[PDB]
Enzyme design. Structure first.
Site, PDB file in Angstrom:
ATOM      1  N   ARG A  54       0.872  -1.133   0.000  1.00 55.10           N
ATOM      2  CA  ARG A  54       0.000   0.000   0.000  1.00 55.10           C
ATOM      3  C   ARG A  54       0.907   1.178   0.000  1.00 55.10           C
ATOM      4  NH1 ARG A  54      -4.128   3.234   3.029  1.00 55.10           N
ATOM      5  NH2 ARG A  54      -2.935   3.005   4.930  1.00 55.10           N
ATOM      6  N   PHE A  59       2.089  10.780   1.277  1.00 54.32           N
ATOM      7  CA  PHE A  59       1.609  10.238   2.578  1.00 54.32           C
ATOM      8  C   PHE A  59       2.616   9.254   3.106  1.00 54.32           C
ATOM      9  CE2 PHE A  59      -2.153   7.622   4.679  1.00 54.32           C
ATOM     10  CZ  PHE A  59      -1.744   8.070   5.896  1.00 54.32           C
ATOM     11  N   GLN A  62       3.648   1.575   2.967  1.00 56.45           N
ATOM     12  CA  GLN A  62       3.235   0.523   3.962  1.00 56.45           C
ATOM     13  C   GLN A  62       3.648  -0.833   3.551  1.00 56.45           C
ATOM     14  OE1 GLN A  62      -0.779   0.984   5.433  1.00 56.45           O
ATOM     15  NE2 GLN A  62      -0.854  -1.089   6.269  1.00 56.45           N
ATOM     16  N   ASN A 101      -2.051  -0.442  12.058  1.00 59.83           N
ATOM     17  CA  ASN A 101      -2.953  -1.168  12.980  1.00 59.83           C
ATOM     18  C   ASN A 101      -4.368  -1.121  12.447  1.00 59.83           C
ATOM     19  OD1 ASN A 101      -4.371   1.093  14.127  1.00 59.83           O
ATOM     20  ND2 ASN A 101      -2.493   1.571  15.329  1.00 59.83           N
ATOM     21  N   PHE A 112       4.766   1.383   8.489  1.00 61.54           N
ATOM     22  CA  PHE A 112       4.854   2.338   7.404  1.00 61.54           C
ATOM     23  C   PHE A 112       5.999   3.319   7.614  1.00 61.54           C
ATOM     24  CE2 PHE A 112       2.609   6.010   9.474  1.00 61.54           C
ATOM     25  CZ  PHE A 112       1.951   5.320  10.507  1.00 61.54           C
ATOM     26  N   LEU A 121      -1.836  11.141  13.085  1.00 60.50           N
ATOM     27  CA  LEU A 121      -1.662   9.790  13.614  1.00 60.50           C
ATOM     28  C   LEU A 121      -1.126   9.693  15.057  1.00 60.50           C
ATOM     29  CD1 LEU A 121      -0.490   8.038  10.327  1.00 60.50           C
ATOM     30  CD2 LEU A 121      -2.865   8.347  11.196  1.00 60.50           C
ATOM     31  N   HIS A 125      -0.990   5.556  16.371  1.00 61.09           N
ATOM     32  CA  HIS A 125       0.007   4.636  15.839  1.00 61.09           C
ATOM     33  C   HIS A 125       1.289   4.788  16.615  1.00 61.09           C
ATOM     34  CE1 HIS A 125      -2.423   3.442  12.286  1.00 61.09           C
ATOM     35  NE2 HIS A 125      -2.985   4.598  12.513  1.00 61.09           N
TER      36      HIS A 125
HETATM   37  C1  LIG Z   1      -0.818   4.794   7.664  1.00 65.85           C
HETATM   38  C2  LIG Z   1      -1.056   3.539   8.457  1.00 65.85           C
HETATM   39  O1  LIG Z   1      -2.334   3.006   7.972  1.00 65.85           O
HETATM   40  C3  LIG Z   1      -2.876   1.898   8.595  1.00 65.85           C
HETATM   41  O2  LIG Z   1      -2.423   1.421   9.622  1.00 65.85           O
HETATM   42  C4  LIG Z   1      -4.133   1.486   7.906  1.00 65.85           C
HETATM   43  N1  LIG Z   1      -4.670   0.271   8.467  1.00 65.85           N
HETATM   44  C5  LIG Z   1      -4.369  -0.934   8.001  1.00 65.85           C
HETATM   45  O3  LIG Z   1      -3.722  -1.059   6.962  1.00 65.85           O
HETATM   46  N2  LIG Z   1      -4.858  -1.944   8.707  1.00 65.85           N
HETATM   47  C6  LIG Z   1      -4.644  -3.372   8.465  1.00 65.85           C
HETATM   48  C7  LIG Z   1      -3.868  -3.918   9.629  1.00 65.85           C
HETATM   49  C8  LIG Z   1      -2.619  -3.362   9.831  1.00 65.85           C
HETATM   50  C9  LIG Z   1      -1.864  -3.809  10.885  1.00 65.85           C
HETATM   51  C10 LIG Z   1      -2.325  -4.758  11.799  1.00 65.85           C
HETATM   52  C11 LIG Z   1      -3.607  -5.300  11.663  1.00 65.85           C
HETATM   53  C12 LIG Z   1      -4.080  -6.302  12.719  1.00 65.85           C
HETATM   54  C13 LIG Z   1      -3.245  -7.168  13.434  1.00 65.85           C
HETATM   55  C14 LIG Z   1      -3.782  -8.001  14.412  1.00 65.85           C
HETATM   56  N3  LIG Z   1      -5.092  -8.000  14.748  1.00 65.85           N
HETATM   57  C15 LIG Z   1      -5.921  -7.143  14.080  1.00 65.85           C
HETATM   58  C16 LIG Z   1      -5.393  -6.299  13.106  1.00 65.85           C
HETATM   59  C17 LIG Z   1      -4.350  -4.861  10.552  1.00 65.85           C
HETATM   60  C1  LIG Z   2      -3.957  -1.381  -1.772  1.00 62.28           C
HETATM   61  C2  LIG Z   2      -4.950  -2.586  -1.886  1.00 62.28           C
HETATM   62  O1  LIG Z   2      -4.365  -3.730  -2.464  1.00 62.28           O
HETATM   63  C3  LIG Z   2      -3.292  -4.554  -2.043  1.00 62.28           C
HETATM   64  O2  LIG Z   2      -2.797  -4.387  -0.973  1.00 62.28           O
HETATM   65  C4  LIG Z   2      -2.944  -5.688  -2.975  1.00 62.28           C
HETATM   66  N1  LIG Z   2      -1.602  -6.260  -2.666  1.00 62.28           N
HETATM   67  C5  LIG Z   2      -0.516  -5.858  -3.426  1.00 62.28           C
HETATM   68  O3  LIG Z   2      -0.667  -5.122  -4.472  1.00 62.28           O
HETATM   69  N2  LIG Z   2       0.708  -6.309  -3.013  1.00 62.28           N
HETATM   70  C6  LIG Z   2       1.918  -5.922  -3.751  1.00 62.28           C
HETATM   71  C7  LIG Z   2       2.040  -6.814  -5.022  1.00 62.28           C
HETATM   72  C8  LIG Z   2       1.974  -8.237  -4.929  1.00 62.28           C
HETATM   73  C9  LIG Z   2       2.059  -8.996  -6.122  1.00 62.28           C
HETATM   74  C10 LIG Z   2       2.170  -8.317  -7.392  1.00 62.28           C
HETATM   75  C11 LIG Z   2       2.166  -6.900  -7.498  1.00 62.28           C
HETATM   76  C12 LIG Z   2       2.309  -6.253  -8.844  1.00 62.28           C
HETATM   77  C13 LIG Z   2       2.898  -6.979  -9.954  1.00 62.28           C
HETATM   78  C14 LIG Z   2       3.050  -6.329 -11.170  1.00 62.28           C
HETATM   79  N3  LIG Z   2       2.635  -5.047 -11.296  1.00 62.28           N
HETATM   80  C15 LIG Z   2       2.095  -4.329 -10.309  1.00 62.28           C
HETATM   81  C16 LIG Z   2       1.896  -4.900  -9.053  1.00 62.28           C
HETATM   82  C17 LIG Z   2       2.103  -6.175  -6.323  1.00 62.28           C
END
Ligand SMILES: CCOC(=O)CNC(=O)NCc1cccc(-c2ccncc2)c1
Ligand SMILES: CCOC(=O)CNC(=O)NCc1cccc(-c2ccncc2)c1
Ligand SMILES: [K+]
Length: 164
Positions: A54, A59, A62, A101, A112, A121, A125
């Site tokens: 992500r 910003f 991640q 989180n 991140f 944040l 965080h």
């Molecule tokens: C800029 C930072 O943004 C974020 O943190 C946006 N949230 C996000 O991506 N959550 C998914 C996530 C990220 C990290 C930990 C957990 C999780 C782990 C264990 N038990 C529940 C949730 C879930």
């Molecule tokens: C933001 C919401 O989606 C996700 O998090 C989806 N995961 C994700 O993209 N992982 C990184 C990843 C994993 C496997 C392949 C590619 C990729 C391959 C070729 N050309 C662009 C991206 C990228």
């Protein structure tokens, strides 16, 4: 002292360089230790071979979901989640290293690197370190993101570990 760790990152198989991070074990020892061990792989799992899933320009970048590669997975060295240690360190600018989180006390492995000051944040965080070298590498990762967070290339942590 505080640990110095590294991430070597590629985009579609091409190296972008190394990010070196200081882990603030003097302030958040439990959080710092989790990330350090996930870097070395010494518990038998960790960041090597996983992705920046992500990435939002102007910003943050991640990563750390080494199980599902999409923000739905990861785990800590302690168990599936662990408490927020403290909120002493703040999101003061680009280069801050902070835990992602899903709400209070949900820290796992996802993290991140900020590319801007993200002070809204603060208190939500846990900040645990910062970039010592390789902000240019972080800006390269940032260039492959989009406003949706989806990346345009596959951004992989091809190696990681501890320098000292
Ligand atoms: C800029 C930072 O943004 C974020 O943190 C946006 N949230 C996000 O991506 N959550 C998914 C996530 C990220 C990290 C930990 C957990 C999780 C782990 C264990 N038990 C529940 C949730 C879930
Ligand atoms: C933001 C919401 O989606 C996700 O998090 C989806 N995961 C994700 O993209 N992982 C990184 C990843 C994993 C496997 C392949 C590619 C990729 C391959 C070729 N050309 C662009 C991206 C990228
Ligand atoms: K926004």
């Amino acid at each position: 002292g505080n640990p110095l760790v590294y991430l070597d990152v590629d985009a579609n198989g091409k190296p972008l360089g190394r990010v070196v991070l200081e882990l603030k074990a003097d302030v958040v020892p439990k959080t710092a230790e989790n990330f350090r061990a996930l870097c070395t792989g010494e518990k038998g799992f960790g960041y090597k071979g996983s992705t920046f899933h992500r990435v939002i320009p102007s910003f943050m970048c991640q990563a750390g979901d080494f199980t599902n590669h999409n923000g739905t997975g990861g785990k800590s060295i302690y168990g599936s989640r662990f408490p927020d240690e403290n909120f002493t360190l703040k999101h003061v600018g680009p280069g801050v290293l902070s835990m992602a989180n899903a709400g209070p006390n949900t820290n796992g492995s996802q993290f991140f690197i900020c590319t801007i000051k993200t002070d809204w944040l603060d208190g939500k965080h846990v900040v645990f370190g910062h970039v010592i070298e390789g902000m240019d590498v972080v800006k390269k990762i940032e260039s492959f993101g989009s406003k949706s967070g989806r990346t345009s290339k596959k951004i992989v942590i091809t190696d990681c570990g501890q320098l000292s």
